[PDB]
Structure 1
Amino acid sequence: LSDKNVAIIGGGPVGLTMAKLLQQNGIDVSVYERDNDREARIFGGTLDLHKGSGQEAMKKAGLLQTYYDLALPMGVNIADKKGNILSTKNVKPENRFDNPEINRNDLRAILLNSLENDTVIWDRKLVMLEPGKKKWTLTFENKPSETADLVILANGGMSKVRKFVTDTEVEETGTFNIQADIHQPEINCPGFFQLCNGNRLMASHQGNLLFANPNNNGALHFGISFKTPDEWKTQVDFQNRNSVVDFLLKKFSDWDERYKELIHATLSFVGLATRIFPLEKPWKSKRPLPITMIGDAAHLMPPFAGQGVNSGLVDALILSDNLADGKFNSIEEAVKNYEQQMFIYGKEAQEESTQNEIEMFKPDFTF
Structure 2
Amino acid sequence: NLLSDKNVAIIGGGPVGLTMAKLLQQNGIDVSVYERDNDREARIFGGTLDLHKGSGQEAMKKAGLLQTYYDLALPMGVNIADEKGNILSTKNVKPENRFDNPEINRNDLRAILLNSLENDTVIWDRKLVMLEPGKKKWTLTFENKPSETADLVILANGGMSKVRKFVTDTEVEETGTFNIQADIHQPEINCPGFFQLCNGNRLMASHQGNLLFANPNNNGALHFGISFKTPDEWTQVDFQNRNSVVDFLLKEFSDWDERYKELIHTTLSFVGLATRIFPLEKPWKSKRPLPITMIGDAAHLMPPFAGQGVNSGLVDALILSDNLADGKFNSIEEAVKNYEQQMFIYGKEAQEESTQNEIEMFKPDFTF
TM-score band (shorter)? Answer: over 0.9
Residue correspondence of structure 1 range 13-24 to structure 2 within 5 A: 13-24=15-26
Structure 1 unmatched runs, 5+: none
Deviations 1:136-159 (A, max 9, x none): 000000000000000000000000
Q: Secondary structure at the match of 2:95?
A: coil
Deviations 1:13-50 (A, max 9, x none): 00000000000000000000000000000000000000
Deviations 1:144-188 (A, max 9, x none): 000000000000000000000000000001000000000000000
CA distance in 2, matches of 1:18, 1:289: 19
Q: Secondary structure at the match of 1:305?
A: coil
Instruction: Give 1:247 deviation, angstroms.
Output: 0.2
Instruction: Give 1:308 deviation, angstroms.
Output: 1.0
Deviations 1:163-220 (A, max 9, x none): 0000000000100000000000000000100000000000000010000000000000
Structure 2 unmatched runs, 5+: none
Deviations 1:268-289 (A, max 9, x none): 0000000000000000000000
Q: Secondary structure at the match of 2:114?
A: helix
> Which residue number in structure 2 is paired with residue 323 of structure 1?
324
Across the two proteins, how many residue pairs are aligned to each other?
366
CA distance in 2, matches of 1:9, 1:172: 24
- Alignment equivalent of 1:111, drawn from 109, 113, 118: 113
Q: Secondary structure at the match of 2:317?
A: helix
CA distance in 2, matches of 1:136, 1:172: 31
Deviations 1:34-86 (A, max 9, x none): 00000000000000000100000000000000000000000000000000000
CA distance in 1, matches of 2:309, 2:12: 15
Instruction: Give 1:10 deviation, angstroms.
Output: 0.2
CA distance in 1, matches of 2:264, 2:5: 55
Q: Secondary structure at the match of 1:362?
A: coil
Instruction: Give 1:133 deviation, angstroms.
Output: 1.1
RMSD of Structure 2 on Structure 1 (CA): 0.4
TM-score by length of 2: 0.99
Deviations 1:231-278 (A, max 9, x none): 10x221000001000100000000000000000010000000000000
CA distance in 1, matches of 2:109, 2:325: 25
CA distance in 2, matches of 1:153, 1:144: 19
Instruction: Give 1:326 deviation, angstroms.
Output: 1.4
Deviations 1:295-341 (A, max 9, x none): 00000000000011000000000000000121111000000000000
CA distance in 1, matches of 2:236, 2:341: 40
CA distance in 1, matches of 2:299, 2:136: 24
CA distance in 2, matches of 1:188, 1:326: 57
Q: Secondary structure at the match of 1:158?
A: coil
- Alignment equivalent of 1:6, drawn from 5, 8, 24: 8
- Alignment equivalent of 2:65, drawn from 63, 66, 83: 63
Q: Secondary structure at the match of 2:239?
A: coil
Moved over 6 A (4+): none
Instruction: Give 1:364 deviation, angstroms.
Output: 1.2
Q: Secondary structure at the match of 1:348?
A: helix
CA distance in 1, matches of 2:327, 2:132: 28
Instruction: Give 1:352 deviation, angstroms.
Output: 0.1
- Alignment equivalent of 1:198, drawn from 183, 197, 200: 200
CA distance in 2, matches of 1:294, 1:151: 11
- Alignment equivalent of 1:52, drawn from 40, 47, 54: 54
Q: Secondary structure at the match of 1:97?
A: coil
Q: Secondary structure at the match of 2:337?
A: helix
CA distance in 2, matches of 1:309, 1:340: 19
CA distance in 2, matches of 1:333, 1:60: 23
CA distance in 2, matches of 1:200, 1:2: 47
Instruction: Give 1:94 deviation, angstroms.
Output: 1.7
CA distance in 1, matches of 2:353, 2:341: 19
Q: Secondary structure at the match of 2:18?
A: helix
CA distance in 2, matches of 1:33, 1:238: 26
> Which residue number in structure 2 is paired with residue 304 of structure 1?
305
Q: Secondary structure at the match of 1:152?
A: strand
Instruction: Give 1:2 deviation, angstroms.
Output: 2.2
CA distance in 2, matches of 1:228, 1:32: 34
Instruction: Give 1:365 deviation, angstroms.
Output: 0.7
CA distance in 1, matches of 2:188, 2:310: 30
> Which residue number in structure 2 is paired with residue 239 of structure 1?
240
CA distance in 2, matches of 1:313, 1:365: 30
CA distance in 2, matches of 1:293, 1:2: 21
Q: Secondary structure at the match of 1:354?
A: helix
Q: Secondary structure at the match of 2:262?
A: helix
Q: Percent identity?
A: 99
